[PDB]
mmCIF file of C-alpha atoms (C1' of nucleotides) and ligand atoms in Angstrom:
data_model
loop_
_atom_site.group_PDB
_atom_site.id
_atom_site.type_symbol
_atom_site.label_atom_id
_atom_site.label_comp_id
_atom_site.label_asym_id
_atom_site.label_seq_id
_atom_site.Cartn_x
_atom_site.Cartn_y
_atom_site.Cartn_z
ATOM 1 C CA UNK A 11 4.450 25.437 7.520
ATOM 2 C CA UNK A 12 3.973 22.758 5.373
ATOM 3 C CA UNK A 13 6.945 20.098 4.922
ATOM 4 C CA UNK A 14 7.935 18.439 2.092
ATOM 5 C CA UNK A 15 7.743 15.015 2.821
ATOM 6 C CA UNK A 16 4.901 13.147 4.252
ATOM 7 C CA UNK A 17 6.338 11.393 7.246
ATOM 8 C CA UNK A 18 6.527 14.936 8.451
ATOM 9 C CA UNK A 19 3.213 15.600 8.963
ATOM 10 C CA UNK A 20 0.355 14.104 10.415
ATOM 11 C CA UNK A 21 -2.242 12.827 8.384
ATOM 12 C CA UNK A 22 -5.646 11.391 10.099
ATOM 13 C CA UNK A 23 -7.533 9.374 8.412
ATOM 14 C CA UNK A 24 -10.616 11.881 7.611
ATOM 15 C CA UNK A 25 -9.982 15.160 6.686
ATOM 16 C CA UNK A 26 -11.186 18.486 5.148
ATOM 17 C CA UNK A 27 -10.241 18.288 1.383
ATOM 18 C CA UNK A 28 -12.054 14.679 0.247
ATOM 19 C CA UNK A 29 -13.042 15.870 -2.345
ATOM 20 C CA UNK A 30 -10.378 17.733 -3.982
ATOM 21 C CA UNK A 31 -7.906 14.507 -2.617
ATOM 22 C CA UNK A 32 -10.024 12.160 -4.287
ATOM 23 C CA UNK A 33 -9.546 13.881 -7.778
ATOM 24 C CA UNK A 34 -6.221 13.913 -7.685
ATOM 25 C CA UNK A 35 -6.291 9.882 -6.561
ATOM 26 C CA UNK A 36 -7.763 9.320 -10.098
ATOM 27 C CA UNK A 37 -5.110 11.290 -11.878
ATOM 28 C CA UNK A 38 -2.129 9.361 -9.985
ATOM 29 C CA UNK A 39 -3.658 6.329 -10.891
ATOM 30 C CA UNK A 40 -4.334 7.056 -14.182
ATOM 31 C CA UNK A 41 -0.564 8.073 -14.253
ATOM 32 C CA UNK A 42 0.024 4.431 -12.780
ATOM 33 C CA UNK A 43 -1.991 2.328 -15.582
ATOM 34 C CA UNK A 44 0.294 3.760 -18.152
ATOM 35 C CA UNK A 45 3.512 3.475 -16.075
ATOM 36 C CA UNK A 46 4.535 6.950 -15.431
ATOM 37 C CA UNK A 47 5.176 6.268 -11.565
ATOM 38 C CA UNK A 48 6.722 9.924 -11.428
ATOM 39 C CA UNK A 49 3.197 11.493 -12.373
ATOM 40 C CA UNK A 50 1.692 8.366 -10.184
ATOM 41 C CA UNK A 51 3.900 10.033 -6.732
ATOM 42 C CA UNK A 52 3.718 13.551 -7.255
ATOM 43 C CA UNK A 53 -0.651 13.745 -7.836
ATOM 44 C CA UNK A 54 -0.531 11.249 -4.501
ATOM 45 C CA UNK A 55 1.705 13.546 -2.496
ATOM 46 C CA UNK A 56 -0.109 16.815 -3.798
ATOM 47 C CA UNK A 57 -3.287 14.460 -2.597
ATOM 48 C CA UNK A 58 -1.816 13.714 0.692
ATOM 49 C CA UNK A 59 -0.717 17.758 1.320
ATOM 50 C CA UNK A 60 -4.612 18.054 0.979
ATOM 51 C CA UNK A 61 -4.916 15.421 3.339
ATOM 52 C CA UNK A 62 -2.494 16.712 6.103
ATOM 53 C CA UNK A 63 -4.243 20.736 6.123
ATOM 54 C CA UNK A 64 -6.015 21.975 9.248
ATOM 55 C CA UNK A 65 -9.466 23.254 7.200
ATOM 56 C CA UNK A 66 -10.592 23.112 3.729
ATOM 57 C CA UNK A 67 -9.120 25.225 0.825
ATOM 58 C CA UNK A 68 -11.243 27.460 -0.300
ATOM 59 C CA UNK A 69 -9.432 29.475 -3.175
ATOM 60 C CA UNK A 70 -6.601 29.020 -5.659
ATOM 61 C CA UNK A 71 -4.699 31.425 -3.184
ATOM 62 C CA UNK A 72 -4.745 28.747 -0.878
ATOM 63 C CA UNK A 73 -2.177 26.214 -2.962
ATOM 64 C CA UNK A 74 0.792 29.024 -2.968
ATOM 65 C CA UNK A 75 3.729 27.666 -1.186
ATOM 66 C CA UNK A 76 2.245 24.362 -0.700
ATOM 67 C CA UNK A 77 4.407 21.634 -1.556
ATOM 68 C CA UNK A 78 3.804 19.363 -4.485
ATOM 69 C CA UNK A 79 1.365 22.057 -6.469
ATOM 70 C CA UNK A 80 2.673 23.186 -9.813
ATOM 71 C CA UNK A 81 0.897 24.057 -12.581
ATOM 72 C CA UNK A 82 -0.821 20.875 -13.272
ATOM 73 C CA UNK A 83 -1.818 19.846 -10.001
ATOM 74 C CA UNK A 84 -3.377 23.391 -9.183
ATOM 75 C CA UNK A 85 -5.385 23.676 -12.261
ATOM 76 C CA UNK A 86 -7.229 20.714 -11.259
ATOM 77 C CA UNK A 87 -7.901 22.001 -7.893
ATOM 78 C CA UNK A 88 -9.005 25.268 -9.118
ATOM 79 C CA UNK A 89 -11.480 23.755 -11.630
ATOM 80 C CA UNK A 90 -13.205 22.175 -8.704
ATOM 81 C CA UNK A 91 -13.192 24.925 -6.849
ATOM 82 C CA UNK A 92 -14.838 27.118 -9.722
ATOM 83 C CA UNK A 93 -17.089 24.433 -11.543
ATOM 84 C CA UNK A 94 -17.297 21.530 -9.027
ATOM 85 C CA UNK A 95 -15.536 19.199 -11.216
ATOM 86 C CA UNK A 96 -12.533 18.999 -13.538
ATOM 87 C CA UNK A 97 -12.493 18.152 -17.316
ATOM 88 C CA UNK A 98 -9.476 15.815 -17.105
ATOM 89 C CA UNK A 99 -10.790 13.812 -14.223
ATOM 90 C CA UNK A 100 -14.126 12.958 -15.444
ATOM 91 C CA UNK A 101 -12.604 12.409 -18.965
ATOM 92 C CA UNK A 102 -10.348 10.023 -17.428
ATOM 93 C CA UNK A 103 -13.208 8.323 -15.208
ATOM 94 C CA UNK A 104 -15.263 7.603 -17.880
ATOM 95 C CA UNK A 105 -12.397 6.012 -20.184
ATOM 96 C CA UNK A 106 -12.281 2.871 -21.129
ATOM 97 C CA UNK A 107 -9.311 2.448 -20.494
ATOM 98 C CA UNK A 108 -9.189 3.402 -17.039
ATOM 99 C CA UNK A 109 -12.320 1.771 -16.378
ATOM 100 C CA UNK A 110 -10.896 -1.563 -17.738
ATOM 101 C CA UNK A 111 -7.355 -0.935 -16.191
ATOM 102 C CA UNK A 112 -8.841 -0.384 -12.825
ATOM 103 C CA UNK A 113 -11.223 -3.468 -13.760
ATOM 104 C CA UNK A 114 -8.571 -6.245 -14.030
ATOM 105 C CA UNK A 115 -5.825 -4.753 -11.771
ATOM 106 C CA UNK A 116 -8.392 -5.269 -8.710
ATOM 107 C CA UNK A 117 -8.100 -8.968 -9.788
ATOM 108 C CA UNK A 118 -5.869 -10.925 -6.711
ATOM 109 C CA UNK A 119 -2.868 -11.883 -9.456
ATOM 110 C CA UNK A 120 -3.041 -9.036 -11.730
ATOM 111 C CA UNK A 121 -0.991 -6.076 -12.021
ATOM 112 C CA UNK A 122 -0.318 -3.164 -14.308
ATOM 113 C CA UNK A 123 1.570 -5.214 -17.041
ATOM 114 C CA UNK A 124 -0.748 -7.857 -17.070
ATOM 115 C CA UNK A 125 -3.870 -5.617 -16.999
ATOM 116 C CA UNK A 126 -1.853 -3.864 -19.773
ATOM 117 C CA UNK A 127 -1.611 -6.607 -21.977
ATOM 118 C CA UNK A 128 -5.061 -8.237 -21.767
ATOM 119 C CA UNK A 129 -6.350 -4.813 -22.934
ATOM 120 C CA UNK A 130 -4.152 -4.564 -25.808
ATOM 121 C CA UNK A 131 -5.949 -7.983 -26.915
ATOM 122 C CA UNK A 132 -9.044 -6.718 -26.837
ATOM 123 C CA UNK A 133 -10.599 -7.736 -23.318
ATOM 124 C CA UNK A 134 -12.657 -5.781 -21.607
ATOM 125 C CA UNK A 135 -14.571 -7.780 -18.727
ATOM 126 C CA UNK A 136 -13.766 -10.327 -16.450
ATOM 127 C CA UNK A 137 -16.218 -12.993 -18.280
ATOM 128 C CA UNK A 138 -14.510 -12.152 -21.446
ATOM 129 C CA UNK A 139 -11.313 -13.675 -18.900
ATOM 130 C CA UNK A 140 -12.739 -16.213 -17.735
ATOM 131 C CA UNK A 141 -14.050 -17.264 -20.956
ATOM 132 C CA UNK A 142 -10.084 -18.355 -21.553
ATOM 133 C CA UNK A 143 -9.120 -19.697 -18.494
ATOM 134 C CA UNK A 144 -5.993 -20.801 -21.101
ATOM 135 C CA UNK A 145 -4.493 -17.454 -20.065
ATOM 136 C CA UNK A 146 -4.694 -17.377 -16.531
ATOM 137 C CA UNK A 147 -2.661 -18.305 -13.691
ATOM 138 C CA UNK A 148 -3.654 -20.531 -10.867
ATOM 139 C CA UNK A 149 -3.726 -17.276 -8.510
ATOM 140 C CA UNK A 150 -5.670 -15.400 -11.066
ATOM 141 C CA UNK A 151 -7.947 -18.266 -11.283
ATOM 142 C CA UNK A 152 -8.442 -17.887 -7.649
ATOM 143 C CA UNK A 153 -8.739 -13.523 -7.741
ATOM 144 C CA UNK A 154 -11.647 -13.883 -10.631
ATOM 145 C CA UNK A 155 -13.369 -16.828 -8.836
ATOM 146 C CA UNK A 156 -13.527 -14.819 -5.796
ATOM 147 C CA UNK A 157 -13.711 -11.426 -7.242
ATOM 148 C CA UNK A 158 -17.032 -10.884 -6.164
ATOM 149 C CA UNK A 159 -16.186 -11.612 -2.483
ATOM 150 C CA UNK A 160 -13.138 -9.509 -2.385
ATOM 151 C CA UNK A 161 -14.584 -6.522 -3.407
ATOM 152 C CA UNK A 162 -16.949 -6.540 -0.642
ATOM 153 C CA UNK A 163 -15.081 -4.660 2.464
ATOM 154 C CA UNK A 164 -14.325 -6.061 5.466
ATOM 155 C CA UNK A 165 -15.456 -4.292 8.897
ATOM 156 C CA UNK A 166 -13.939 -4.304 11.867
ATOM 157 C CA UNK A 167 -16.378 -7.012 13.237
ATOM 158 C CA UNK A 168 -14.986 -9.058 10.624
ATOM 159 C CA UNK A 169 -11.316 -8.566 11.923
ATOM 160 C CA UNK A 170 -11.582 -9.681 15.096
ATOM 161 C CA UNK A 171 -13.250 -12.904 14.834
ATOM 162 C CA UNK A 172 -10.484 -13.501 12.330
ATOM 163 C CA UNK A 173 -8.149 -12.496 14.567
ATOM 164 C CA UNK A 174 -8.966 -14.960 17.689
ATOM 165 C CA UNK A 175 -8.550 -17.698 14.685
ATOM 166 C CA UNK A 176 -5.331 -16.712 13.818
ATOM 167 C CA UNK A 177 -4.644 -16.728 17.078
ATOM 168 C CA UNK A 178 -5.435 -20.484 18.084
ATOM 169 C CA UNK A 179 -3.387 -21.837 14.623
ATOM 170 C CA UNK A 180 -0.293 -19.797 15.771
ATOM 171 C CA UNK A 181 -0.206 -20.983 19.322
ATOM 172 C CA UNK A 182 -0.488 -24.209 18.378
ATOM 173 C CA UNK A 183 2.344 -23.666 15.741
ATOM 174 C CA UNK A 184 4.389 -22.244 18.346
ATOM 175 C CA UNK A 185 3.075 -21.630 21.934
ATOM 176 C CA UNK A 186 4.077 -17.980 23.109
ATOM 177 C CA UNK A 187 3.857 -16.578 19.634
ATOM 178 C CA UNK A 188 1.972 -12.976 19.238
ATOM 179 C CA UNK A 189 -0.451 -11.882 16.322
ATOM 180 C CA UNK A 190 -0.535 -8.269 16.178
ATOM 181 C CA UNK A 191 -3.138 -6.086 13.986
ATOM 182 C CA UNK A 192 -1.136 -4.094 10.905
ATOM 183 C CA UNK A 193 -2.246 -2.362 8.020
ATOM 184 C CA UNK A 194 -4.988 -0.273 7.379
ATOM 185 C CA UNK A 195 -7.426 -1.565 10.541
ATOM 186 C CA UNK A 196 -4.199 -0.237 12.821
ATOM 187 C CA UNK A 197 -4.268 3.385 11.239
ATOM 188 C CA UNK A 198 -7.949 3.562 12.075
ATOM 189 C CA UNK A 199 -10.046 2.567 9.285
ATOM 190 C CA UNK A 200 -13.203 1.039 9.804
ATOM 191 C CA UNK A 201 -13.507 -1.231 6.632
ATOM 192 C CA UNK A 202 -10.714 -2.265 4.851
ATOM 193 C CA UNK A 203 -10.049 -4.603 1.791
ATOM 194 C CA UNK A 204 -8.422 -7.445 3.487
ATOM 195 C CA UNK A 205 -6.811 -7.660 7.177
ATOM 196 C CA UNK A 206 -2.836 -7.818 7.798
ATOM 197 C CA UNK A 207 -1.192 -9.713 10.404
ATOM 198 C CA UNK A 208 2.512 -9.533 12.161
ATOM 199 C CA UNK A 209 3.700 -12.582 14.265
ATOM 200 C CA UNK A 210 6.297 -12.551 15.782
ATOM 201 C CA UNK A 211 7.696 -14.359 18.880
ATOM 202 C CA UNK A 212 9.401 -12.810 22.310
ATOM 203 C CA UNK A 213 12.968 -15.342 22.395
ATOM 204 C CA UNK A 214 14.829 -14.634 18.930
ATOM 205 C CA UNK A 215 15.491 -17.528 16.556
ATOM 206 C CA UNK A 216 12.116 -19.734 17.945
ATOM 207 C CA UNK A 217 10.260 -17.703 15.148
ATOM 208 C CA UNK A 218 12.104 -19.490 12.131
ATOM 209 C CA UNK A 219 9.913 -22.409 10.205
ATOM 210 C CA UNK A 220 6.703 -20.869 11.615
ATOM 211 C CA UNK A 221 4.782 -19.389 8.779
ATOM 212 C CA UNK A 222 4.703 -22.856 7.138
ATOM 213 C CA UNK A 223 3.231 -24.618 10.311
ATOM 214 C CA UNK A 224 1.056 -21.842 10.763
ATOM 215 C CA UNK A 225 -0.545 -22.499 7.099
ATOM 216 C CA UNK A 226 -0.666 -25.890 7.524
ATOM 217 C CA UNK A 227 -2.853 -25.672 10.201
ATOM 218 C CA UNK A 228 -5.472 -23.079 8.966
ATOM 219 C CA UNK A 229 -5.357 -25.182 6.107
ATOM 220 C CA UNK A 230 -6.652 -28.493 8.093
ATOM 221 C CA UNK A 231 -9.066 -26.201 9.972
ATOM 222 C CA UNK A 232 -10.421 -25.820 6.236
ATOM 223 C CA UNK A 233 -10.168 -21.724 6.719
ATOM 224 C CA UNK A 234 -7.783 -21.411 3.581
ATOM 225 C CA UNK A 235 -9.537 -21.231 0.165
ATOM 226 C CA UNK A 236 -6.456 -20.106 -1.264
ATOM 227 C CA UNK A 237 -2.969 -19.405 -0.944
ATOM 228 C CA UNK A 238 0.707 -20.416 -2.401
ATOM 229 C CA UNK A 259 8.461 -18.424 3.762
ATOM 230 C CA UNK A 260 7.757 -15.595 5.573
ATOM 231 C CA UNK A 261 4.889 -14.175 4.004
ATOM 232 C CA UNK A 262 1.468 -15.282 2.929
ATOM 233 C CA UNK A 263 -1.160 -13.799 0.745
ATOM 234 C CA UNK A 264 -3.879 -16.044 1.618
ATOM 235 C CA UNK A 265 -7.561 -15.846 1.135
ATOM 236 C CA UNK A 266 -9.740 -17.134 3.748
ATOM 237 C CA UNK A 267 -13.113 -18.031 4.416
ATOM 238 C CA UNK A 268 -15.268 -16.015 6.871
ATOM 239 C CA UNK A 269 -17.999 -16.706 8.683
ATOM 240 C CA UNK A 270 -21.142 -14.722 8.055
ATOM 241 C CA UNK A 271 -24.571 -15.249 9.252
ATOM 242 C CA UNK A 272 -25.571 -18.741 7.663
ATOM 243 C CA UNK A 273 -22.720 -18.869 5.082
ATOM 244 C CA UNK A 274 -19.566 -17.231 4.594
ATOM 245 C CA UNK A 275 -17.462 -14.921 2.396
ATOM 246 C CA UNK A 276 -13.811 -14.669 0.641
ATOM 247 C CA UNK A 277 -11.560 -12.203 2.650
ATOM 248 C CA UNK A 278 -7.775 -11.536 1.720
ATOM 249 C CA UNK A 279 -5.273 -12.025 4.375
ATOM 250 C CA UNK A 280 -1.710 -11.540 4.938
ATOM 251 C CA UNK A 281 0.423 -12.830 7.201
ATOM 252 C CA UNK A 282 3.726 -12.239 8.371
ATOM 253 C CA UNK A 283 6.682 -13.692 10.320
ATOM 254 C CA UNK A 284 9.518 -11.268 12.251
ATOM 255 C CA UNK A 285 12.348 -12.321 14.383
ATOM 256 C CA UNK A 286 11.112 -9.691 17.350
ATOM 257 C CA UNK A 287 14.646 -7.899 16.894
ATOM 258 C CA UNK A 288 13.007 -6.986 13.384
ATOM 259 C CA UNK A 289 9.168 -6.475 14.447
ATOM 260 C CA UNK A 290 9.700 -2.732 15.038
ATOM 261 C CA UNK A 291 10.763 -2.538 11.130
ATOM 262 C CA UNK A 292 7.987 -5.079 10.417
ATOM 263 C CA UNK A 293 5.412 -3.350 12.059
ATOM 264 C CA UNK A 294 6.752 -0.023 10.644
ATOM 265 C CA UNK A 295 6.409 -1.170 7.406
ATOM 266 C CA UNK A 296 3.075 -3.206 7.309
ATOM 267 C CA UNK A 297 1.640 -0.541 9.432
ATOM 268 C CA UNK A 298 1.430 1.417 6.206
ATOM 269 C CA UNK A 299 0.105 4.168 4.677
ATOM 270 C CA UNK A 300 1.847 2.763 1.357
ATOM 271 C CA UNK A 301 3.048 6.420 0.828
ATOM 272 C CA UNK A 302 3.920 6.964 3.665
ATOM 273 C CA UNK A 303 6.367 4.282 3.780
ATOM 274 C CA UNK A 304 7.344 5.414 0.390
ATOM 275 C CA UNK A 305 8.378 8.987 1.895
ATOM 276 C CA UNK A 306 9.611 7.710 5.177
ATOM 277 C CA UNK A 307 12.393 5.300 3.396
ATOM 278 C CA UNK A 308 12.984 8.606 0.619
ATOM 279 C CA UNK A 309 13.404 10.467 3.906
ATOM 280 C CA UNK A 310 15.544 8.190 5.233
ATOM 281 C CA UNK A 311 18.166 7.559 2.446
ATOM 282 C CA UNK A 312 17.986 11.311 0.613
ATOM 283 C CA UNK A 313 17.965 13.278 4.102
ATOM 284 C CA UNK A 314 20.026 11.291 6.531
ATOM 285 C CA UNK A 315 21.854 8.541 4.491
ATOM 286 C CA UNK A 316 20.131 6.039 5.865
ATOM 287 C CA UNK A 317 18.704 2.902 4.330
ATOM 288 C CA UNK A 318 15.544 1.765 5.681
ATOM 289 C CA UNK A 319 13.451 -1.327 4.959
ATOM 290 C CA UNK A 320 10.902 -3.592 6.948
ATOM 291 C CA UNK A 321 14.071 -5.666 8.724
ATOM 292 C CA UNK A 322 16.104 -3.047 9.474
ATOM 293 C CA UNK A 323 17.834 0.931 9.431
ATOM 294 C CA UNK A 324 21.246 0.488 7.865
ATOM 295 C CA UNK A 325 24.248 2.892 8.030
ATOM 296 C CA UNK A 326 26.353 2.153 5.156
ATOM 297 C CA UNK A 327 29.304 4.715 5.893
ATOM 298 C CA UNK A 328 29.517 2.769 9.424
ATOM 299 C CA UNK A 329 27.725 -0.298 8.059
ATOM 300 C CA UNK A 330 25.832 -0.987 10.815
ATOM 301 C CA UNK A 331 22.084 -1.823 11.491
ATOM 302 C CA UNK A 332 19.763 0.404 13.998
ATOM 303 C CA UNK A 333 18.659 -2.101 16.793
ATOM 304 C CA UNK A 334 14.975 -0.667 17.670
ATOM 305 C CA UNK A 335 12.691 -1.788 20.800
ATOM 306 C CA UNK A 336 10.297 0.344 19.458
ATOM 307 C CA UNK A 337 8.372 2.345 16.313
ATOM 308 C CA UNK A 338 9.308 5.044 18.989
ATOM 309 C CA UNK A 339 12.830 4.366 18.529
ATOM 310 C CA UNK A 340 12.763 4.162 14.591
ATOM 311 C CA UNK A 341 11.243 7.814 14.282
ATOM 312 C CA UNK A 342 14.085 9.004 17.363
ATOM 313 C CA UNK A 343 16.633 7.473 14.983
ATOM 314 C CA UNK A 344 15.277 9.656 11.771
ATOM 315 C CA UNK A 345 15.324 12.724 13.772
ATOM 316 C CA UNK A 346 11.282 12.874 13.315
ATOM 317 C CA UNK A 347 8.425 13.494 15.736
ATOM 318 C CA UNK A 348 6.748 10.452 16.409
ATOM 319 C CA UNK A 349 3.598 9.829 14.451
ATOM 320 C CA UNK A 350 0.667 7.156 15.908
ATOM 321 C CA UNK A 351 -0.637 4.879 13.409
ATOM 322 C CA UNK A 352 -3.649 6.780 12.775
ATOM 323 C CA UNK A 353 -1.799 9.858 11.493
ATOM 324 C CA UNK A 354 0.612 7.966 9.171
ATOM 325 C CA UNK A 355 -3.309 7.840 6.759
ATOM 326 C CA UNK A 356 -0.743 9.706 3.814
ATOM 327 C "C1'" DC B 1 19.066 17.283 -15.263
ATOM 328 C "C1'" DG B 2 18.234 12.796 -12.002
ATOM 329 C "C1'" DG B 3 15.281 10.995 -8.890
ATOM 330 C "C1'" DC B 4 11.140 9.021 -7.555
ATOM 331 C "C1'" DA B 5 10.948 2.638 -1.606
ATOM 332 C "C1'" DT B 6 12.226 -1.615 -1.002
ATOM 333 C "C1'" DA B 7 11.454 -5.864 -0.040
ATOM 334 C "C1'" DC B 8 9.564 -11.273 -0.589
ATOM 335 C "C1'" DG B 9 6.657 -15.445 -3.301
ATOM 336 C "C1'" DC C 1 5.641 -11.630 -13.298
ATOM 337 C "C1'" DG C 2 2.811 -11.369 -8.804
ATOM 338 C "C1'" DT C 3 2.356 -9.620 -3.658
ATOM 339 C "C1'" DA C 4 2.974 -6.148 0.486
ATOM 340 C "C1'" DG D 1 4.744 16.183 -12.140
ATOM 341 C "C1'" DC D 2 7.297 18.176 -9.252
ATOM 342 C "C1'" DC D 3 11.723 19.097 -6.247
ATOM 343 C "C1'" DG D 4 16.323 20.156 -5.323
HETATM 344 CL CL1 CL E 401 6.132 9.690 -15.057
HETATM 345 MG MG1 MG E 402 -4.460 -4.143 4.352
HETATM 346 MG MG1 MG E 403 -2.584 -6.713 2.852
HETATM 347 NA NA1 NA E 404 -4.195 -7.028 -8.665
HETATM 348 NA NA1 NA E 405 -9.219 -21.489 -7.459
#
DNA sequence: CGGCATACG
DNA sequence: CGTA
DNA sequence: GCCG
């Protein structure tokens, strides 16, 4: 009753098993800071099974014939279920390493191998960073100077101001060109770590050359405190009552024959994306990405009007935004 | 055992 | 390498 | 770490 892959499956946003999916979060990224992305998917897709289940589990019983629970995975959850906490997890938690790993691959301009590295030299905070600016990257620079900011979350209220913003700069750029909401703030969530936008525009082809005028703009409206096409990763300033604060935001470009793939894709969750293109490719030879659906034995690409038509085309029920929360 | 999503800046 |  |  439970399938295998997570664009299968509904999965809201808040659920029954928090706790027990929030353990197994810490192992599969625990599993990520030392690069063993195998270990990384399988504790988030046991997480996510937690995620997707009507009620909460209550005994060990309840893991048989559950999909992604072996040995491993249900020896965690039965600790917690006996002793309210597992051994493994809280060693991990309280690691340095993971502590510092999580610590500098928050940074905006720092990943895994980078984080990696540092802590091989010895660094442990993000003074002990900035301290030798020598080693960092102007993007970096721009992460640790706004650190503070960016780990603040961003509400709702935030995103819509933002939004109207947005907005004015693209029809300016471009008159008849739409912003629509993606990410996180689409599947439901009430805070979120930055805010995501799609743009796209209704006649194909006008779209092309827009992000840059679209940047250019925000940029003389003195919004942009930071950023580098068809994608941005910008951050901007916000207004808050009598200041402001860093936000991260992304925007994107689409030809509208793409924006069903685009919107797809930066829709999220990031596993479910993950197991909707595995899903794709290993169960109906199909290659999917953000632009497109590709047949390769007929080598020919899916035209979409819709997300609706994406999930026909897959052979899955359709899924809203907020149950796609894997 | 092989496989584990797939792009762009 | 970073980003999504 | 788990699946097929
Ligand atoms: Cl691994
Ligand atoms: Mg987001
Ligand atoms: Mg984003
Ligand atoms: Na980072
Ligand atoms: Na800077």
């Amino acid at each position: 009753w439970m399938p295998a892959y997570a664009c299968q499956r509904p999965t809201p946003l808040t659920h029954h098993n928090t706790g027990l999916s929030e353990a197994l979060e810490i192992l599969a990224e625990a599993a990520g800071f030392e690069g063993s992305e195998g270990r990384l998917l399988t504790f988030c897709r046991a997480a996510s099974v937690l995620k997707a289940l009507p009620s909460p589990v209550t005994t060990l019983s309840q893991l048989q014939g559950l999909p992604h629970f072996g040995e491993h995975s249900s020896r965690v959850v039965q600790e917690l279920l006996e002793h309210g906490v597992c051994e493994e997890v809280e060693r991990v938690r309280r690691s340095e390493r993971y502590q510092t790993m999580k610590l500098f691959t928050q940074i905006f301009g720092v990943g895994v191998k980078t984080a990696d590295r540092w802590y091989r030299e010895g660094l442990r905070t993000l003074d002990d960073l900035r301290e030798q600016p020598q080693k960092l990257t102007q993007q970096q620079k721009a992460g640790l100077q706004h650190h503070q900011d960016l780990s603040t979350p961003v509400l709702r209220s935030d995103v819509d101001a933002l939004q109207q913003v947005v907005e004015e700069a693209v029809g300016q750029a471009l008159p008849g060109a739409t912003v629509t909401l993606t990410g996180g703030f689409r599947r439901g969530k009430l805070q979120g770590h930055d805010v995501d936008f799609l743009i796209t525009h209704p006649k194909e082809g006008q779209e092309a050359g827009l992000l840059p005028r679209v940047m250019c703009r925000l940029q003389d409206q003195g919004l942009i405190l930071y950023h580098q096409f068809e994608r941005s990763f910008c951050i901007f300033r916000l207004p808050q009552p009598g200041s402001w604060k860093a936000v991260r935001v992304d925007l994107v470009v689409a030809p509208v024959s793409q924006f069903p793939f685009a919107l797809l894709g930066w829709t999220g969750s990031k596993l479910f994306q993950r197991e909707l293109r595995r899903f794709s490719r290993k169960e109906k030879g199909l290659w999917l990405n953000s632009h497109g659906l590709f047949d390769p034995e007929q080598k020919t690409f899916f035209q979409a009007a819709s997300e609706e038509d994406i999930f026909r085309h897959l052979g899955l029920e359709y899924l809203p935004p907020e149950q796609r929360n894997a």
